[PDB]
Design a protein around this ligand. Sequence first.
Ligand SMILES: Nc1nc2c(ncn2[C@H]2CC[C@@H](COP(=O)(O)OP(=O)(O)OP(=O)(O)O)O2)c(=O)[nH]1
Ligand SMILES: [Mg+2]
Length: 579
Amino acid sequence: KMAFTLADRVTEEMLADKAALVVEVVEENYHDAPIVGIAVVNEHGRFFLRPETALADPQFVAWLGDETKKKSMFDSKRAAVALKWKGIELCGVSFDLLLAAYLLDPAQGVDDVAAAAKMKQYEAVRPDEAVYGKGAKRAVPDEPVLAEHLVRKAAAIWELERPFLDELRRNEQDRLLVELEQPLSSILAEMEFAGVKVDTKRLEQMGKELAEQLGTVEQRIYELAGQEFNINSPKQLGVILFEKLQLPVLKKTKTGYSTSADVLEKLAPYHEIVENILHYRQLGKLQSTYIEGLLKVVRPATKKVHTIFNQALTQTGRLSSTEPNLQNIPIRLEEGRKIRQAFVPSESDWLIFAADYSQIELRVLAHIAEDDNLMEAFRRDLDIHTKTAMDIFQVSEDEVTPNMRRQAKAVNYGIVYGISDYGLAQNLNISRKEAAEFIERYFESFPGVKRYMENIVQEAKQKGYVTTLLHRRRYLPDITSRNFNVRSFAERMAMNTPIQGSAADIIKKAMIDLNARLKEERLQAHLLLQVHDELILEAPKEEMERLCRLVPEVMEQAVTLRVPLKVDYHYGSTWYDAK
DNA sequence: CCTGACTCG
DNA sequence: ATCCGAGTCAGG
Ligand SMILES: Nc1nc2c(ncn2[C@H]2CC[C@@H](COP(=O)(O)OP(=O)(O)OP(=O)(O)O)O2)c(=O)[nH]1
Ligand SMILES: [Mg+2]
């Protein structure tokens, strides 16, 4: 049905200046993964190329790297990074169908071309899973079957571009695609390929010392319990706590007794064993995930880890980070924080530089809600996380520890994003009446925030979606639901999404601005990671002074709000020391 | 394979 | 019933 040339060699007509390009990587983690086939669709026709042929062809490599030869693709970051591992530069990506679909509707969870095509009732292409299979059965099919699939995906991209661009334009999201998400994709590609260097000697020694400590804590828990059991089994643990030891049952889930951290903390007045168990479960996660799990994914020759930043996953416009997740490295407890000493610069005499937006969603909220009490607190450079702390612990602005401030930060965001008196009461282990009284006084200090949250909920019910500063959108069909729980969740998404998503928009723009700046000043410094409202770079020790001005500046100037954006920063010999 | 742990923003 | 957004892991 669909005619294409199964080419044995690259020809001139394949190198047109506009094309849909497919560079197929079957493995989910595309780092150093095989490219199994290439397809090109342009004005002159449809072509399948063998990677061995095409990627060793100097005209084709030239064309890939030519920014004036425009390519339309699906998930160009995947292709760009796979090509980098093949030592080939990909330039000229002008349209990314994945990112287009994601902006039109993040809820569709589009993750292959077929799923994007479905959005415009385009059905002349198969889902990847149907072609490659799943799990132990996953495999590249016979060449003619593979070639047709890749060509059909290219043909789909070729035909779907205008219809997607048109709809994006109708939604005012065209610039969000072309000026924000697509340039960010190339930047993330650079960051993933660069990777972050790991001190495996240090990590392995931490691991050995952690194993000894675990055994010690383990034995202590068995002594306290009067029995050996699997502490890492909530089921077995529940039997020990609520049957053998007869501690009060505070919560159940569908599977049985809850042994959540919140529940165990509340049981501390009944038996000291619950504090030891909380400690054990923390240490065990450090070992399984941040020592063993991390060492498993280190590339042994370079000692680097290469995360994948999923740019088309979260419902709010944030990135996520996978395999490994480098956006959830411990920091809150010193015991875990020490893992960060194993993340080091990739060159000698280089340093890690970390910058963090201050009270970021509180600033964005002030701007969007136009709450005058709040817009003012930032014009007076107040720290609302700390003030809240002083209040909930009756402790004053000098005595507030980082930990207390951390807790207050969850209270602040909790309240603005719709926590109930019950939730705040369970969170601070205080009485519900007191919690309710606190929420009351909070919205008295910031009446505009309260008005904004009431108004954005009604607007969501009327329109069926909410939007961010740069026109990112989330649909919320459930919000007019007759069901209280379903409706309630949707209402709180209406309160939170515009704010968290606007904050995502901002740091994304900041990353693009920051890179352009690094280049024009010919600095060696480059981004390693983004952590939602943090940017982490590495650079020669001599560029620290310049970065101390460049980075906070670019991040603060990414957008202009009705309040000051404020960025905190540090650098040091390891990520840990960048404090 | 999911659930409930722990981790982060 | 009860702030929001994420990922990985051991146990089952
Ligand atoms: N709904 C919600 N969002 C949170 C919570 N913690 C963090 N976030 C979101 C909101 C802020 C954003 C950044 O995290 P941070 O810890 O840096 O919070 P921050 O407000 O910027 O504080 P800081 O001034 O210390 O940098 O991520 C939380 O407990 N609930
Ligand atoms: Mg911050």
